[PDB]
Amino acid sequence: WTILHYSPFKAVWDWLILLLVIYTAVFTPYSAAFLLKCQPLAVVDLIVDIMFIVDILINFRTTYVNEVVSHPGRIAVHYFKGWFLIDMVAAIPFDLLIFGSEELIGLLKTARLLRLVRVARKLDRYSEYGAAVLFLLMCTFALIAHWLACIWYAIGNMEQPHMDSRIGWLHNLGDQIGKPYNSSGLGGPSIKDKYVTALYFTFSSLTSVGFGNVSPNTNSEKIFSICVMLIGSLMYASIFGNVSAIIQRLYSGTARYHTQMLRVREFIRFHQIPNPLRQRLEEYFQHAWSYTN
Amino acid sequence: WTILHYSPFKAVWDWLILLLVIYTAVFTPYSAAFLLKCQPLAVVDLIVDIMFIVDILINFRTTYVNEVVSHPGRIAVHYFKGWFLIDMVAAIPFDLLIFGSEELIGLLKTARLLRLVRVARKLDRYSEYGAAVLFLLMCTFALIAHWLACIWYAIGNMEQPHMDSRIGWLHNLGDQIGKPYNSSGLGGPSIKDKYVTALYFTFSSLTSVGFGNVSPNTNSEKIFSICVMLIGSLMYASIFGNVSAIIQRLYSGTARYHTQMLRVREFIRFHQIPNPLRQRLEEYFQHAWSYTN
Amino acid sequence: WTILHYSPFKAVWDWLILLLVIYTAVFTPYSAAFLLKCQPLAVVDLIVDIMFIVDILINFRTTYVNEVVSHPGRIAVHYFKGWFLIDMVAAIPFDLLIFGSEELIGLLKTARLLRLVRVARKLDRYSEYGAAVLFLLMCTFALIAHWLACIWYAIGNMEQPHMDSRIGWLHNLGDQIGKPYNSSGLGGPSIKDKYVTALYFTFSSLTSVGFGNVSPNTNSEKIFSICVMLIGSLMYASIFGNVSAIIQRLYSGTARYHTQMLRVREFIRFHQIPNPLRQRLEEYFQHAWSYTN
Amino acid sequence: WTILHYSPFKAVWDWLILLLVIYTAVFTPYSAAFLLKCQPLAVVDLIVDIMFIVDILINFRTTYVNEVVSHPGRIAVHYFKGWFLIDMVAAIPFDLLIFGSEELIGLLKTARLLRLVRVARKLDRYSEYGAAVLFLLMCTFALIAHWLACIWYAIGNMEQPHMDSRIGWLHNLGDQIGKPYNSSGLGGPSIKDKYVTALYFTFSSLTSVGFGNVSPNTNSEKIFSICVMLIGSLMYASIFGNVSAIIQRLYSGTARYHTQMLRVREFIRFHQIPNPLRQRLEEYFQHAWSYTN
């Protein structure tokens, strides 16, 4: 058998895989930055890896447009000559394959971020609806702020064994919250204190609030903030440009309505129309508009 | 008898109830955050509650459009099947009904914020005029900045008995203004010092100035600032998008005028028109424009 | 005799009076804030007051449009029934009239700020040219930042005799630049240090940089910053809205050119036009455009 | 012989000279600010000066439009009466000519910044392509942020021998990174620490983050920040205005597509079209669009 790409199943499956890609975009960068050295997130990662493998089987058994193509040989060769390479690299279980340092093995799971390409392929499904693209834009904003928080903690953490002698942002965090790093390397803030501070700093830099209790102090932290300021400015010209445009697109019925109403009102003023005829004109405009949009 | 919904009375009553909803939106969040443990604001709340009850009686005795409907039975059943439930929940005097802790009784008056729905219903009256919608947008800005100041003080205050050991924003405020909290819990800033600082911080976060004498230090304060940065960015794409668009709408006569004037001027340049004919052309344009707009 | 309102004299005089209004808008707020307790600015103020009196005589002897009116009686009665009241209040020499405290006498010269109305009247002359309105918008920005610097110093200075006990912004300035206020009230920063810091703070608040070495600390300073954040946000929706629109208006020839060029290029692509005919099409487009704009 | 100005050689040479102008715009301001008192950048400057001299020879031997002109006498006299003066001032090797203080000799090489005029002349080549003008706009942003970093270090450095007594930004930098200036003038930060901090401050001021670990403290630093706030605001109204407009221009196919699709969808809703005819309408729209754009 074979699946039609416009069926109610394949429509729901493509919206379900968007939510599993959003899960991968959150918990893969987090695990690679904060957790290096079954549990619920270890079995949920296994379930989600199994669903991204089931999606390869669905991609071998779904129709496509050349007019629709429905023969399994003409489907399978199209997927092989298309995206199958990226989909298999995003699905090889390197962590279960390898037996070689656990730092590299935990970092190598960042290959799962190729699952973001499954959202870039399918944008013709997701972008069609105004409330869906406005959701995607705010999740692109929150995911970029999260990925930058993982890089900012990777920088701030690597400068402790490559020791800066109390200069970088983690030593300042320890002193500010009353959880100082001891001279032996003991103590210091928790993973919640470090993550919530790293995410607070990257929203503060991207939205340009710059609150000044977290501030970049070593050269790698200053060079990172120059990059976040070049990202955040292009990203405000693009994301919040598009969000304000989509808000105006949803508002376009109201914008057209008031523009034609103001023309009718200014016409009624300019000709000084008597009340019985004025009411007939402005009531007819409201009927004609509320009928045809 | 019965009231016509377009009458000069019902027009003025709907603008008066907007001002009583703006009073509820200010003094209910303030009393629930800053004042928990007749006076003028106790009797003014009683007068305003009585007017929001009188408005339920007016809503039972006003006509509506199906063509207008004027029979009191067809009015009353329409209000019951419509908004009467929300209007009665917004008008039950819980504080006068109950006899059971005074913290809960003072918090339960936040049900009065359902009166904001009386403004959302009637937007077809209020949004029709450019100076009125520009006022509403600046009051939505100032009321969101005020509601966030009440949440920010609720957070900063709750972390003192759930004691942070001198980390949160109220201990920093006490040290900055020369009114420190003593080790016994005595002293500290006044309600004016705490409110004006909380409102200053939420305008500073929403407008993105981030002045850095008030800055979020505990995890609940940092998680609150991440929310205020996600609000403030969507809200600049929406409120100050609409305010700049309404300013351009009020300016649209001037924008059209200069666009048609520049076309006439560039035409007069391109054909190199002699002075007597040039004056006749550019004076006729000013007459035709100042006549028809 | 009588002056034609479109003459080369009256055109140059109205541009000269704009520069004397910009001088009044700078040096009147500055003198009222920073200098209270001949010199070049004392004689230049006398020369400029004499020119704003000569302008009243020109306003009695210039034609106006009802068709032009040229009889001196029909001119003089029109100026009396129009703006003469504001022009005389802006020209009464109160400082030379009075003989009663010198604080009030120096403050009373702020009546000269009614000369800003001479710019608001004549906007039909000034707003006609794109480079002139873009200059006016940047001078409205710099003059609002300057007037707010004069209010910010008036607040910060009045809280020293109404003594805050070392809390307000002037005590912090003295400590930061190494010019502390002594306990006797001696020492402290110069008028250059206080003015340049006050103007730096109001550009930092209006443009929303918020650098955090000057920050508002008393309640009057925090309430002032809430006002500067409500001004600066409406003012970015209006001034830098209009500056970006005027930049796009000056760019409109280039925007039209590339829009029609891209249509011609996409047409040439879609029909796959052969090179000799393609060159004839795209050269003809450049000739037709460079001829007619 | 003579070169056609539209030839594949002259097209590639004008794109190569853009990259050598971007090199001059980086390393000339840097050398004049940071390095005053063969190496790779000394021989690369010699190679690049030789290529800007070869470009004068190409400018004497290239055709131009009056219809094209191809006689070497009518070319050479046009270049002499045009830009040859600026091109020779940008190419006189003052550093190799002179033998008189090395401070002045190193500063005098800033005449090479006249090579930026070779980009301003040729904008009809570079501005034609959307990805090229979006690159130019981000390089104008990064080059203005770099030139301001060179001025900011020139100010901060000149106030050390014109000694401020520990007030300016370089003394604060030395104390913040754990590399203090000693009382003898010994020690202090490296050229990497000073450059990366100066560039971090000017991106922080232009993008308006204002992080508050670097902040202007002397009057020349405050007057510089008032200028960077007047630049950064005009520059956001212009550069990020144009970048957001070019992003919308690249998006214009998608914006047109969804606007016509939404009209077709709302028409199909309003007439309640049966499924077989609906599919024929919305498939025909996709064919017609994907054919003609």
CSV table of N, CA, C and O in Angstrom, one decimal, chain C residues 170-248:
chain,number,residue,atom,x,y,z
C,170,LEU,N,23.4,64.1,41.3
C,170,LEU,CA,24.5,65.0,41.4
C,170,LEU,C,25.5,64.5,42.4
C,170,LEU,O,26.7,64.6,42.1
C,171,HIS,N,25.2,63.9,43.5
C,171,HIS,CA,26.1,63.3,44.4
C,171,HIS,C,26.9,62.1,43.8
C,171,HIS,O,28.1,62.0,43.9
C,172,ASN,N,26.2,61.3,43.0
C,172,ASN,CA,26.8,60.2,42.3
C,172,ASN,C,27.8,60.8,41.2
C,172,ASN,O,28.9,60.3,41.1
C,173,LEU,N,27.4,61.8,40.5
C,173,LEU,CA,28.3,62.5,39.5
C,173,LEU,C,29.6,62.9,40.2
C,173,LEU,O,30.7,62.7,39.7
C,174,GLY,N,29.5,63.6,41.3
C,174,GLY,CA,30.6,64.1,42.1
C,174,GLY,C,31.6,63.0,42.4
C,174,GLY,O,32.8,63.1,42.2
C,175,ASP,N,31.1,61.9,42.9
C,175,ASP,CA,31.9,60.7,43.3
C,175,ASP,C,32.5,60.0,42.1
C,175,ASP,O,33.6,59.5,42.2
C,176,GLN,N,31.8,60.0,40.9
C,176,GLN,CA,32.3,59.3,39.7
C,176,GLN,C,33.4,60.0,39.0
C,176,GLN,O,34.4,59.3,38.6
C,177,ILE,N,33.4,61.3,38.9
C,177,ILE,CA,34.4,62.1,38.1
C,177,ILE,C,35.6,62.5,39.0
C,177,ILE,O,36.5,63.2,38.6
C,178,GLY,N,35.6,62.2,40.3
C,178,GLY,CA,36.6,62.7,41.3
C,178,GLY,C,36.5,64.1,41.6
C,178,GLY,O,37.5,64.8,41.9
C,179,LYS,N,35.3,64.7,41.7
C,179,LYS,CA,35.0,66.0,42.2
C,179,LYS,C,33.9,66.0,43.2
C,179,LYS,O,32.8,66.5,42.9
C,180,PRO,N,34.0,65.3,44.3
C,180,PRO,CA,33.0,65.1,45.3
C,180,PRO,C,32.4,66.4,45.9
C,180,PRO,O,33.2,67.4,46.1
C,181,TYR,N,31.1,66.4,46.2
C,181,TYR,CA,30.6,67.4,47.1
C,181,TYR,C,31.1,67.2,48.5
C,181,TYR,O,30.9,66.1,49.1
C,182,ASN,N,31.7,68.2,49.1
C,182,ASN,CA,32.1,68.2,50.6
C,182,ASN,C,30.9,68.3,51.5
C,182,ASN,O,29.8,68.8,51.1
C,183,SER,N,31.0,67.8,52.7
C,183,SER,CA,29.9,67.8,53.7
C,183,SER,C,29.4,69.3,54.1
C,183,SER,O,28.2,69.4,54.5
C,184,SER,N,30.2,70.3,53.9
C,184,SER,CA,29.8,71.7,54.0
C,184,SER,C,29.0,72.2,52.8
C,184,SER,O,28.6,73.4,52.8
C,185,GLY,N,28.8,71.4,51.7
C,185,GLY,CA,28.2,71.8,50.5
C,185,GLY,C,29.1,72.4,49.4
C,185,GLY,O,28.7,72.8,48.3
C,186,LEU,N,30.4,72.6,49.8
C,186,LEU,CA,31.5,73.1,48.9
C,186,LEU,C,31.9,72.0,47.8
C,186,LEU,O,31.5,70.8,47.9
C,187,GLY,N,32.7,72.4,46.8
C,187,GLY,CA,33.2,71.5,45.8
C,187,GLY,C,32.1,71.1,44.8
C,187,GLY,O,31.3,72.0,44.4
C,188,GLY,N,32.1,69.9,44.4
C,188,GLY,CA,31.2,69.3,43.4
C,188,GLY,C,31.5,69.7,41.9
C,188,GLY,O,32.5,70.4,41.7
C,189,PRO,N,30.9,69.1,40.9
C,189,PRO,CA,31.1,69.2,39.5
C,189,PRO,C,30.9,70.6,39.0
C,189,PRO,O,30.1,71.4,39.5
C,190,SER,N,31.5,71.0,37.8
C,190,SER,CA,31.3,72.3,37.1
C,190,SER,C,30.0,72.3,36.3
C,190,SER,O,29.4,71.3,36.1
C,191,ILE,N,29.6,73.4,35.8
C,191,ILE,CA,28.4,73.5,34.9
C,191,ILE,C,28.6,72.7,33.6
C,191,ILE,O,27.6,72.1,33.2
C,192,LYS,N,29.8,72.6,33.1
C,192,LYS,CA,30.0,71.7,31.9
C,192,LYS,C,29.9,70.2,32.3
C,192,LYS,O,29.2,69.5,31.6
C,193,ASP,N,30.4,69.8,33.4
C,193,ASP,CA,30.2,68.4,33.9
C,193,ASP,C,28.8,68.0,34.1
C,193,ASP,O,28.3,67.0,33.8
C,194,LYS,N,28.0,69.0,34.7
C,194,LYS,CA,26.6,68.8,35.0
C,194,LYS,C,25.7,68.9,33.8
C,194,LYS,O,24.9,68.0,33.6
C,195,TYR,N,25.9,69.8,32.9
C,195,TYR,CA,25.2,69.9,31.6
C,195,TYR,C,25.5,68.7,30.7
C,195,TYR,O,24.6,68.0,30.3
C,196,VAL,N,26.8,68.4,30.5
C,196,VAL,CA,27.1,67.3,29.6
C,196,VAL,C,26.6,65.9,30.1
C,196,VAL,O,26.2,65.1,29.3
C,197,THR,N,26.6,65.7,31.4
C,197,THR,CA,26.0,64.5,32.1
C,197,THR,C,24.5,64.5,31.9
C,197,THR,O,23.9,63.5,31.6
C,198,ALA,N,23.8,65.6,32.2
C,198,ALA,CA,22.3,65.7,32.0
C,198,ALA,C,21.9,65.4,30.6
C,198,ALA,O,20.9,64.7,30.4
C,199,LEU,N,22.6,66.0,29.6
C,199,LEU,CA,22.3,65.8,28.2
C,199,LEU,C,22.6,64.3,27.7
C,199,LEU,O,21.8,63.7,27.0
C,200,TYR,N,23.7,63.8,28.2
C,200,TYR,CA,24.0,62.4,28.0
C,200,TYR,C,23.0,61.4,28.6
C,200,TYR,O,22.6,60.5,27.9
C,201,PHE,N,22.5,61.7,29.8
C,201,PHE,CA,21.4,60.9,30.3
C,201,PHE,C,20.1,61.0,29.5
C,201,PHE,O,19.5,59.9,29.3
C,202,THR,N,19.7,62.1,29.0
C,202,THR,CA,18.4,62.2,28.3
C,202,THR,C,18.5,61.6,26.9
C,202,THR,O,17.6,61.0,26.5
C,203,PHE,N,19.7,61.8,26.2
C,203,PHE,CA,19.8,61.0,24.9
C,203,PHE,C,19.9,59.5,25.2
C,203,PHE,O,19.2,58.7,24.5
C,204,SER,N,20.6,59.0,26.3
C,204,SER,CA,20.6,57.6,26.7
C,204,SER,C,19.2,57.1,27.1
C,204,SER,O,18.9,55.9,26.7
C,205,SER,N,18.3,57.8,27.7
C,205,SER,CA,16.9,57.4,28.0
C,205,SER,C,16.0,57.5,26.7
C,205,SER,O,15.3,56.6,26.5
C,206,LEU,N,16.1,58.5,25.9
C,206,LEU,CA,15.3,58.7,24.7
C,206,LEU,C,15.6,57.6,23.6
C,206,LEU,O,14.7,56.9,23.2
C,207,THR,N,16.9,57.5,23.3
C,207,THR,CA,17.4,56.5,22.4
C,207,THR,C,17.4,55.1,23.0
C,207,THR,O,17.6,54.1,22.3
C,208,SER,N,17.1,54.9,24.3
C,208,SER,CA,17.0,53.7,25.0
C,208,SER,C,18.3,52.9,25.2
C,208,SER,O,18.3,51.7,25.4
C,209,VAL,N,19.5,53.6,25.2
C,209,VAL,CA,20.7,52.9,25.5
C,209,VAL,C,20.8,52.6,27.0
C,209,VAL,O,21.2,51.5,27.4
C,210,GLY,N,20.5,53.5,27.9
C,210,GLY,CA,20.5,53.3,29.3
C,210,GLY,C,21.8,52.8,29.9
C,210,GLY,O,21.9,51.8,30.5
C,211,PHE,N,22.9,53.5,29.7
C,211,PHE,CA,24.3,53.1,30.0
C,211,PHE,C,24.6,52.7,31.5
C,211,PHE,O,25.6,52.1,31.7
C,212,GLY,N,23.8,53.2,32.5
C,212,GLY,CA,23.9,52.6,33.8
C,212,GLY,C,25.0,53.2,34.7
C,212,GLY,O,25.1,52.7,35.8
C,213,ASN,N,25.8,54.2,34.3
C,213,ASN,CA,26.6,55.0,35.2
C,213,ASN,C,25.8,56.2,35.8
C,213,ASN,O,25.9,56.5,37.0
C,214,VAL,N,24.9,56.8,35.0
C,214,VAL,CA,23.9,57.7,35.5
C,214,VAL,C,22.6,56.9,35.5
C,214,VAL,O,22.2,56.3,34.5
C,215,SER,N,21.9,56.7,36.6
C,215,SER,CA,20.7,56.1,36.8
C,215,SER,C,19.8,56.7,37.9
C,215,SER,O,20.4,57.3,38.8
C,216,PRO,N,18.5,56.8,37.7
C,216,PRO,CA,17.6,57.5,38.6
C,216,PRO,C,17.4,56.8,39.9
C,216,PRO,O,17.1,55.6,39.9
C,217,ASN,N,17.5,57.5,41.0
C,217,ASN,CA,17.6,56.9,42.3
C,217,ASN,C,16.6,57.4,43.3
C,217,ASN,O,16.0,56.6,44.1
C,218,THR,N,16.3,58.7,43.4
C,218,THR,CA,15.1,59.2,44.2
C,218,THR,C,13.8,59.0,43.5
C,218,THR,O,13.8,58.7,42.3
C,219,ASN,N,12.7,59.1,44.2
C,219,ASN,CA,11.4,58.9,43.5
C,219,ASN,C,11.1,59.9,42.4
C,219,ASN,O,10.5,59.6,41.4
C,220,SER,N,11.5,61.2,42.6
C,220,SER,CA,11.2,62.2,41.6
C,220,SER,C,12.1,61.9,40.3
C,220,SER,O,11.6,62.1,39.2
C,221,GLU,N,13.3,61.4,40.4
C,221,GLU,CA,14.1,60.9,39.3
C,221,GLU,C,13.5,59.7,38.6
C,221,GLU,O,13.5,59.6,37.4
C,222,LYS,N,13.0,58.7,39.4
C,222,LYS,CA,12.3,57.6,38.8
C,222,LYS,C,11.0,58.0,38.1
C,222,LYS,O,10.7,57.5,37.0
C,223,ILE,N,10.2,58.9,38.6
C,223,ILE,CA,9.0,59.4,38.0
C,223,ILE,C,9.3,60.2,36.8
C,223,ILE,O,8.6,60.1,35.8
C,224,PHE,N,10.4,61.0,36.8
C,224,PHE,CA,10.9,61.6,35.6
C,224,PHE,C,11.3,60.6,34.5
C,224,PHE,O,10.8,60.7,33.4
C,225,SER,N,12.1,59.6,34.8
C,225,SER,CA,12.4,58.5,33.9
C,225,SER,C,11.2,57.8,33.3
C,225,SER,O,11.2,57.4,32.1
C,226,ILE,N,10.1,57.5,34.1
C,226,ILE,CA,8.9,57.0,33.5
C,226,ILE,C,8.3,57.9,32.5
C,226,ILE,O,7.9,57.5,31.4
C,227,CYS,N,8.3,59.2,32.7
C,227,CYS,CA,7.8,60.2,31.7
C,227,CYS,C,8.7,60.2,30.5
C,227,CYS,O,8.2,60.2,29.4
C,228,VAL,N,10.1,60.2,30.6
C,228,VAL,CA,11.0,60.2,29.5
C,228,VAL,C,10.8,58.9,28.7
C,228,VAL,O,11.0,58.9,27.5
C,229,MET,N,10.5,57.7,29.3
C,229,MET,CA,10.2,56.5,28.6
C,229,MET,C,8.8,56.5,27.9
C,229,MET,O,8.7,56.0,26.8
C,230,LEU,N,7.8,57.2,28.4
C,230,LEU,CA,6.6,57.4,27.6
C,230,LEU,C,6.7,58.5,26.5
C,230,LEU,O,6.1,58.3,25.4
C,231,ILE,N,7.5,59.5,26.7
C,231,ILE,CA,7.9,60.5,25.6
C,231,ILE,C,8.7,59.7,24.6
C,231,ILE,O,8.3,59.7,23.4
C,232,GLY,N,9.8,59.1,24.9
C,232,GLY,CA,10.8,58.5,24.0
C,232,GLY,C,10.1,57.4,23.1
C,232,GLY,O,10.5,57.3,21.9
C,233,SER,N,9.2,56.7,23.6
C,233,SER,CA,8.4,55.6,22.8
C,233,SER,C,7.4,56.2,21.8
C,233,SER,O,7.5,55.9,20.6
C,234,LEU,N,6.6,57.2,22.2
C,234,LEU,CA,5.7,58.0,21.3
C,234,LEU,C,6.5,58.7,20.2
C,234,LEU,O,6.2,58.8,19.0
C,235,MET,N,7.7,59.3,20.6
C,235,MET,CA,8.6,60.0,19.8
C,235,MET,C,9.4,59.2,18.8
C,235,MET,O,9.6,59.6,17.7
C,236,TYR,N,9.7,57.9,19.1
C,236,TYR,CA,10.3,57.0,18.1
C,236,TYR,C,9.2,56.5,17.2
C,236,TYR,O,9.5,56.4,16.0
C,237,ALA,N,7.9,56.3,17.6
C,237,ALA,CA,6.8,56.0,16.7
C,237,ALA,C,6.5,57.2,15.7
C,237,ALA,O,5.9,57.0,14.7
C,238,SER,N,6.9,58.4,16.0
C,238,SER,CA,6.6,59.7,15.3
C,238,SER,C,7.8,60.3,14.6
C,238,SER,O,7.8,60.3,13.4
C,239,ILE,N,8.8,60.7,15.3
C,239,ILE,CA,10.0,61.4,14.7
C,239,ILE,C,10.8,60.4,13.8
C,239,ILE,O,10.9,60.6,12.6
C,240,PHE,N,11.3,59.3,14.3
C,240,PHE,CA,12.0,58.3,13.5
C,240,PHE,C,11.2,57.5,12.6
C,240,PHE,O,11.7,57.0,11.6
C,241,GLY,N,9.8,57.4,12.8
C,241,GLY,CA,8.9,57.0,11.8
C,241,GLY,C,8.9,58.0,10.6
C,241,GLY,O,9.2,57.6,9.5
C,242,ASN,N,8.7,59.3,10.8
C,242,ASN,CA,8.8,60.3,9.8
C,242,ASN,C,10.2,60.4,9.1
C,242,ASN,O,10.3,60.5,7.9
C,243,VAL,N,11.3,60.4,9.9
C,243,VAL,CA,12.7,60.4,9.3
C,243,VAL,C,12.9,59.2,8.3
C,243,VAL,O,13.3,59.4,7.2
C,244,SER,N,12.5,58.0,8.8
C,244,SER,CA,12.6,56.8,7.9
C,244,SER,C,11.7,56.9,6.7
C,244,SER,O,12.1,56.6,5.5
C,245,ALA,N,10.5,57.4,6.8
C,245,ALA,CA,9.6,57.7,5.7
C,245,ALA,C,10.1,58.8,4.7
C,245,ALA,O,10.1,58.6,3.5
C,246,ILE,N,10.7,59.9,5.2
C,246,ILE,CA,11.4,60.9,4.4
C,246,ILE,C,12.6,60.4,3.7
C,246,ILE,O,12.8,60.6,2.5
C,247,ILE,N,13.4,59.6,4.3
C,247,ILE,CA,14.5,58.8,3.7
C,247,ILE,C,14.0,58.0,2.5
C,247,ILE,O,14.5,58.0,1.4
C,248,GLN,N,12.9,57.2,2.8
C,248,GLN,CA,12.2,56.4,1.7
C,248,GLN,C,11.6,57.3,0.6
C,248,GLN,O,11.6,56.9,-0.6
